[PDB]
């Protein structure tokens, strides 16, 4: 037992709260951003060659929820943004919505 | 307005500014609000209130929020002053194969199957 | 509404005292007992008629140098013995059994001096300890385990001073040098799960250290009330009381007069002040006020040796009351006031290791 | 065919065009409201009135 790891509880709380300060956002966006950033923290992704596997595992965990959230459509908008930032290939964006169901 | 704002800022460290003075001036002159979505209300996709809007405003928030390096929204160690996803990319990096897309195929209908090359 | 000096005493070491605490666990009829702590000594007395007060017991620490700070009377559920715990500058907490005249428990986990101790009105094994470490701890004095640590990314930044249970014992307030006053909750599910857990742990059973709870957020706060230190707060039903070195005591409620106490959103950014109370010459800090178990009168010490008394009744705080009972012997200062379970007697400590007594004549 | 093309789904197409610019079979495959021919059709309706790339 080494009482130390990458995820400090108080941090997860603080970031969500800080997100909620923003006025000019829809719940269909804030929920997404949080659900993602938390999983980002949970594993510590650095290398760009990871981002493909990243979104994969992301829905691999949060499948039931976004469905239960009925929020997959904004998930796809996020996929768009991320490809726009040159980290996704089109060869996987769809593949996500595929694995989704 | 200006002198009154300065006097209020002097008498109060809590206010301490004419910026909040003009903010309250605008809140009292108009006294109305479009919505939680910006003054250009951008309702969500996954919700009932839909409104077809161009691509830019659809991705505006996402662009105006992302921090590329840490791959997170609101980098806690990156200032957000930067350039958006407005950049260049390879416009021709696909397969580009014509096929019967199905019964209601875009191809397999010489109107659209030829207008595609026409629209090229 | 008239107390009279029927006795006054004085120590020998002449070093100022701070603590006065009647034992509010007197089975009806039992004699009045109360204690007081000084430089490095504790004192046991008993109230007798005709302004008589009788020395009972006294202990002392020699092995180091400390200036004890606070005390609190409780009991033992197991055998009903009276229980008193004290703590000083060294930051250690001791627990003494007068029935055996020994200390049975000691606690050391802070980093600076301690400033106050209180107990949950209902549970007798829950001790709250406020320190200068900016961290307000809370122990299970029975199973010898910590429970919570309030303070962190959003805590107090400088030397927490004073706290106070709500009347029922699920809500707390805190005040410290940083002009800051923050609300904590206890009723939360998580919290009470934690407590119940605390009541169940065998160290021999597991190879695991008990797991405390860290809380990094007040339920609500502000610093708009005073522009100076804040060093004593009191729950008032669902209203608030606090003092500063600004020579006025204030009463307020959070939010608006309409705003319920239990609906308050954490991001609340408004408070409602109701009234002020006034006095003279409290130009130093670390001076406290107290109130009767029946929440009907107010006592307050003074710098120049005076007193100031009000009534917690329908007396409108605009012109509620004014009652100053005075004597001509010491005007050094008076730290703390204390009533019995009833409103019979009232004690106060002068700054010069001298005691006072005032017997009420209603 | 004049079909149900939701402002959600329609802005959705407005975005999806910035992604392939030539594939109805994929865009409509994502936008479950339209039809791939209707996508070609709506393009002949809307994307015919689009700006040059």
Swiss-Prot record, chain A:
Cellular compartments annotated: Nucleus
Residues covered by region (VEFS-box): 1-58
Phosphoserine modification, residue list: 2
Annotated disulfide bonds: none
Induction (free text): Expression is induced by E2F1, E2F2 and E2F3.
Superkingdom, natural source: Eukaryota
Tissue specificity comment: Overexpressed in breast and colon cancer.
Reported modifications of this chain: Sumoylated, probably by PIAS2.
Function text: Polycomb group (PcG) protein. Component of the PRC2 complex, which methylates 'Lys-9' (H3K9me) and 'Lys-27' (H3K27me) of histone H3, leading to transcriptional repression of the affected target gene. The PRC2 complex may also serve as a recruiting platform for DNA methyltransferases, thereby linking two epigenetic repression systems. Genes repressed by the PRC2 complex include HOXC8, HOXA9, MYT1 and CDKN2A.
Disorder noted: A chromosomal aberration involving SUZ12 may be a cause of endometrial stromal tumors. Translocation t(7;17)(p15;q21) with JAZF1. The translocation generates the JAZF1-SUZ12 oncogene consisting of the N-terminus part of JAZF1 and the C-terminus part of SUZ12. It is frequently found in all cases of endometrial stromal tumors, except in endometrial stromal sarcomas, where it is rarer.
Remarks, miscellaneous: Under hypoxic conditions, the precursor SUZ12 RNA undergoes regulated trans-splicing with the JAZF1 RNA, resulting in a chimeric isoform which may be protective against apoptosis. The chimeric transcript is characterized by JAZF1 exons 1-3 joined to SUZ12 exon 2-16. The chimeric transcript is expressed primarily in the endometrium from late secretory and early proliferative phases of the menstrual cycle, but not in normal myometrium at any phase of the cycle. Its expression is slightly induced by low levels of progesterone, but suppressed by both estrogen and high levels of progesterone.
Family: Belongs to the VEFS (VRN2-EMF2-FIS2-SU(Z)12) family.
Protein known as: Polycomb protein SUZ12
Organism: Homo sapiens (Human)
Gene designation per UniProt: SUZ12
Residues of the full protein shown: 582 to 682 of 739
Swiss-Prot record, chain B:
Induction description: Expression is induced by E2F1, E2F2 and E2F3. Expression is reduced in cells subject to numerous types of stress including UV-, IR- and bleomycin-induced DNA damage and by activation of p53/TP53.
Job description of the protein: Polycomb group (PcG) protein. Catalytic subunit of the PRC2/EED-EZH2 complex, which methylates 'Lys-9' (H3K9me) and 'Lys-27' (H3K27me) of histone H3, leading to transcriptional repression of the affected target gene. Able to mono-, di- and trimethylate 'Lys-27' of histone H3 to form H3K27me1, H3K27me2 and H3K27me3, respectively. Displays a preference for substrates with less methylation, loses activity when progressively more methyl groups are incorporated into H3K27, H3K27me0 > H3K27me1 > H3K27me2.
Protein name as it appears in the record: Histone-lysine N-methyltransferase EZH2
Subcellular location(s) of the protein: Nucleus
Protein family membership: Belongs to the class V-like SAM-binding methyltransferase superfamily. Histone-lysine methyltransferase family. EZ subfamily.
Connected disease: Weaver syndrome: A syndrome of accelerated growth and osseous maturation, unusual craniofacial appearance, hoarse and low-pitched cry, and hypertonia with camptodactyly. Distinguishing features of Weaver syndrome include broad forehead and face, ocular hypertelorism, prominent wide philtrum, micrognathia, deep horizontal chin groove, and deep-set nails. In addition, carpal bone development is advanced over the rest of the hand.
PTM comment, free text: Phosphorylated by AKT1. Phosphorylation by AKT1 reduces methyltransferase activity.
Organism: Homo sapiens
Residue window of the full protein shown: 220 to 339 of 746
UniProt modified residues of type Phosphothreonine: 120
From Swiss-Prot, chain C:
Phenotype for residue 285 to A: Abolishes binding to H3K27me3
Repeat positions for WD: 12-55, 63-106, 109-149, 155-196, 225-262, 280-320, 329-362
Post-translational modification remark: Methylated. Binding to histone H1 'Lys-26' promotes mono-, di-, and trimethylation of internal lysines.
Effect of residue 285 to L: Abolishes binding to H3K27me3
Residue positions where N6,N6-dimethyllysine is found in the record: 118, 189, 205
Residue segments, region Required for interaction with the matrix protein MA of HIV-1: 70-224, 222-362
Modified positions (N6,N6,N6-trimethyllysine) in chain numbering: 118, 189, 205
Free-text note on domains in this protein's UniProt record: The WD repeat domain mediates recognition of trimethylated histone peptides at the consensus sequence Ala-Arg-Lys-Ser. This is achieved through an aromatic cage encircling the methyllysine, and involving Phe-18, Tyr-69 and Tyr-286.
Pathology noted in the entry: Cohen-Gibson syndrome: An autosomal dominant overgrowth disorder characterized by accelerated osseous maturation, advanced bone age, skeletal abnormalities including flaring of the metaphyses of the long bones, large hands with long fingers and camptodactyly, scoliosis, cervical spine anomalies, dysmorphic facial features, and variable intellectual disability.
Name of the protein: Polycomb protein EED
Species: Homo sapiens
């Amino acid at each position: 037992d080494s009482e130390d790891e990458k995820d400090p509880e108080w941090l997860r709380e603080k970031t969500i709260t800080q997100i909620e300060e923003f006025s000019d956002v829809n719940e269909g966006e804030k929920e997404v951003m949080k659900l993602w950033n938390l999983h980002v923290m949970k594993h510590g992704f650095i290398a760009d060659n990871q981002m493909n596997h990243a979104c994969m595992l992301f829905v691999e965990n949060y499948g039931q929820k976004i469905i239960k959230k009925n929020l997959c459509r904004n998930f796809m908008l996020h996929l768009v943004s991320m490809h726009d930032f040159n980290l996704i290939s089109i060869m996987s964006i769809d593949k996500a919505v595929t694995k989704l169901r | 307005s200006d002198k009154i704002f300065e006097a209020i800022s002097s008498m109060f460290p809590d206010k301490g500014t004419a910026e909040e003075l003009k903010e309250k001036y605008k809140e009292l002159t108009e006294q109305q609000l479009p919505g939680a979505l910006p003054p250009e209300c951008t309702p969500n996709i996954d919700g009932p209130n839909a409104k077809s809007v161009q691509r830019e405003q659809s991705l505006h928030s996402f662009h105006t929020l992302f921090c590329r390096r840490c791959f997170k929204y609101d980098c806690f160690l990156h200032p957000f002053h930067a350039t958006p996803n407005t950049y260049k990319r390879k416009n021709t990096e696909t397969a580009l194969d014509n096929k019967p897309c199905g019964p209601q195929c875009y191809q397999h209908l010489e109107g659209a199957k030829e207008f595609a090359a026409a629209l090229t | 509404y008239s107390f009279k000096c029927v006795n006054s005493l004085k120590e020998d070491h002449n070093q100022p005292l701070f603590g006065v605490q009647f034992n509010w666990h007197s089975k009806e009829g039992d004699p009045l007992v109360f204690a007081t702590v000084g430089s490095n000594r504790v004192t046991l007395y008993e109230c007798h008629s005709q302004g008589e007060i009788r020395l009972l017991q006294s202990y002392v620490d020699a092995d180091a140098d400390e200036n004890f700070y606070t005390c609190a009377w409780t009991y033992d559920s197991n055998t009903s013995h009276p229980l008193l715990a004290v703590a000083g500058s060294r930051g250690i907490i001791r627990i003494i059994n007068p029935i055996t005249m020994q200390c049975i428990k000691h606690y050391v986990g802070h980093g600076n001096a301690i400033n106050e101790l209180k107990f949950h009105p209902r549970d007798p094994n829950l001790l709250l300890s406020v320190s200068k470490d900016h961290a307000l701890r809370l122990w299970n004095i029975q199973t010898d385990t910590l429970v919570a640590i309030f303070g962190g990314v959003e805590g107090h930044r400088d030397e927490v001073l004073s706290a106070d249970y709500d009347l029922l014992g699920e809500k707390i307030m805190s005040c410290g040098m940083d002009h800051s006053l923050k609300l904590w909750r206890i009723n939360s599910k998580r919290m009470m799960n934690a407590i119940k857990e605390s009541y169940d742990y065998n160290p021999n059973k597991t190879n695991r250290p008990f797991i405390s709870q860290k809380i990094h957020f007040p339920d609500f706060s502000t610093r708009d009330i005073h522009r100076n230190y804040v060093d004593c707060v009191r729950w008032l039903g669902d209203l608030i009381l606090s003092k500063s070195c600004e020579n006025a005591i204030v009463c307020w409620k959070p939010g608006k007069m309409e705003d319920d106490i239990d609906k308050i959103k954490p991001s609340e950014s408004n408070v409602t002040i109701l009234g002020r109370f006034d006095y003279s010459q409290c130009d130093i800090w670390y001076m406290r006020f107290s109130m009767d178990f029946w929440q009907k009168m107010l006592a307050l010490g003074n710098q120049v040796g005076k007193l100031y008394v009000w009534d917690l009744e329908v007396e409108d705080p605009h012109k509620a009351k004014c009652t100053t009972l005075t004597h001509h012997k010491c005007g050094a200062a008076i730290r703390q006031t204390s009533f019995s379970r009833d409103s019979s007697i009232l004690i106060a400590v002068c700054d010069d290791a001298s005691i006072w007594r005032w017997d009420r004549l209603r | 065919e004049n079909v149900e093309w939701s402002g959600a789904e329609a802005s959705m197409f407005r975005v999806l065009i910035g992604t392939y610019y030539d594939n109805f079979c994929a865009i409509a495959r994502l936008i479950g409201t339209k039809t791939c021919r209707q996508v070609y059709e709506f393009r002949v309706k809307e994307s015919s009135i689009i700006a040059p790339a």
